[PDB]
Structures are given as C-alpha cells and as structure tokens.
C-alpha cells in the first residue's frame, strides 16, 4: 500500500530541477553537484572520467539513500580551473568516447557477418 | 433480473429476490453469481 510507483525512479515531476549546483564552503574551488533521478550507472561514469583530469584533486559520488534516487558529486579542482568546467569536460569526453565505441562496434559487426 | 449458475448441472437460471433457491432440472441448492459486466483493466506488472 506504500509501495512507490515503479516510474518514480527515472521520471521528474513538476518543479524538480535535474541538476543542483551548490558551492562548498569548507574548501576553495570545491563544488557539490546534486543530480535527481539518477543512480550508479551515471554517477560512476563521471567520477571515473573526472579522475583522469590532472587538474582535478578530488571527485566522488554517493547515493545518500537507496530508496530516494539522487546522486551527490563533490568535485575539488586546482585554482583557476572551475569545478563546473571540470564536470562539463567530463561529460563531453564520455560522449566522444561512446560515439567512438558505437562506430567501432558497427565496423566489427559488418566484418563479423560474412568476413 | 438476476442470473445465477447452478453448482451441479451448470445451467444459468433467472431467479429473483424472495424466492427459495432451487435450480430447475436438478434441485440443487447452491447457486453462483456469474461474473460482472463492467470493465476490468490490469497491468501486466
């Protein structure tokens, strides 16, 4: 009777922003992103792309609680590199990876069939 | 008025309020309520 709807995990209702950016006062150049209606699929890709960036000192995510679906990503970069720039370059670098993987998987298919 | 199903010979008979319950062509006293007409719609979940 209290079971939440199945669709409630990936669907946003009125008023919920997808992303919420809040600066972090503990630290200089630290920012904390809040992603609604996402899980470890999306959060883990980005964290692991941020740690390749040598100008990123810290990156990590957590699901605060499993029953509510949101991600919280802290990022701390070096001075004169903004933590919002770090998080955008991460997303464009995956897109430039996954667009290279979808093209290389199509070539191996045609090679595989009758070849 | 109300169509009921005999629990023995399985013949729908029409029997109405303030009548003893006996199905014609058996004599069996247990009647069932058939099934509702209105729309039932389920999730396949």
């Amino acid at each position: 009777m209290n079971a939440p709807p199945a669709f409630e995990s990936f669907l946003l209702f009125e008023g919920e922003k997808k992303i919420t950016i809040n600066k972090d006062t503990k630290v200089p150049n630290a920012c904390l992103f809040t992603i609604n209606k996402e899980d470890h699929t999306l959060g883990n890709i980005i964290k692991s792309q941020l740690l390749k960036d040598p100008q990123v000192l810290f990156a990590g995510y957590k699901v605060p609680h499993p029953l509510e679906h949101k991600i919280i990503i802290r990022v701390q970069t070096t001075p004169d590199y903004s933590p919002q720039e770090a998080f955008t370059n991460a997303i464009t670098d995956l897109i430039s990876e996954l667009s290279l993987l979808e093209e290389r998987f199509r070539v191996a298919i045609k090679d595989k069939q009758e070849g | 008025p109300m169509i009921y199903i005999c629990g023995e010979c399985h013949t729908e008979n029409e029997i109405k309020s303030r009548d003893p319950i006996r199905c014609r062509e058996c004599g069996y006293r247990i009647m069932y309520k058939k099934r509702t007409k209105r729309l039932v719609v389920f999730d396949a979940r």
Binding site: M1, L11, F13 | -
Partner: protein, 154 residues
C-alpha cells in the same frame, strides 16, 4: 420545511414557537430533535455579521423595539431570548434583516488520460474542486490526480 423552538413542556405535548412566530401544540414524538448550528453566521440590517450569543436590537417587524440574545439561526430566521419577555418563556422570532447588532463525479469509473499514471482504470472515492482520488483497479492503492487528467468511461 418548518423548524421551531420548544417553549413549554406538557405531559404528552410541547408548545413550539415555529419559525413564523406562531405557537403550535405537538405530541412529543411528532417533532424531531434538530442539530443546532452554534457556528451559524448571518447578516443583520446593516450588513454586520451576527452570530449565536450576540445581543441585537429589533428595528422593524412585529417585535420592533425589543432587544434579545440570538439563541438559534435558520435560513432567514432568528430565534431570540429576552428574559423580560414573559410570553413563550422569553423566546421570540425575528427576520435577520429586522435586527441590528447592539458530488456528481464520485462513483464514476474514470481512465487517467495524462501524466505518469496514463491508462489506469479506476473509480473515484472522493471528488474535490481540484484533485479527485481515483481508486486503482490494477494495483492496491489510491492516488490523487488533477481532474483535468481524468476521463469518465461509460
């Protein structure tokens, strides 16, 4: 259609002051006890809000010049009490304008036509000015949906 106030007790009957200002005799069982609305509000002759317990003056009609305490209110009628009035145990009735202060949807089967629940069939438990409560036939649960989403089926 008619309400009144009991103003005398007899062994088999009451004397009742009706809402028109006449006193009638009725057997104890010929009248039913009515739930009093202690929170009733009405307008007086100067458009003031008046309430039960208020002291009002009568400025028109038969009791013009009298003063009384509002005991009961019903539609266009006020039953008042004044202890100086020996008639009818102090009770009398005045028009409020002669005074001055001194659902159809529920039960239907609807199909949710928009939003995340789109397609589910249900029956309305409660209807509101805004959001009806649909009782889902598919699962065990009741949900609140804007009434713009619902669509009645047959």
């Amino acid at each position: 259609q008619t309400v009144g106030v009991i103003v005398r007790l007899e062994r088999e009957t009451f004397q009742v002051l009706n809402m028109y200002g006449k006193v009638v005799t009725v057997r104890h069982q010929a009248v039913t006890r009515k739930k009093d609305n202690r929170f009733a509000v009405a307008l007086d002759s100067e458009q003031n809000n008046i309430h039960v317990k208020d002291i009002v003056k009568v400025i028109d009609g038969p009791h013009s010049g009298r003063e009384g305490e509002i005991r009961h209110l019903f539609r266009s009628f006020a039953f008042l009490h004044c202890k100086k009035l020996v008639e009818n145990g102090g009770m009398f009735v005045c028009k409020t304008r002669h005074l001055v202060l001194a659902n159809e949807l529920i039960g239907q089967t609807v199909r949710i036509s928009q939003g995340p629940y789109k397609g589910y069939i249900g029956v309305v438990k409660d209807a509101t000015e805004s959001t009806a409560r649909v009782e889902l036939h598919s699962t065990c649960q009741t949900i609140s949906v804007d009434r713009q989403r619902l669509t009645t089926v047959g």
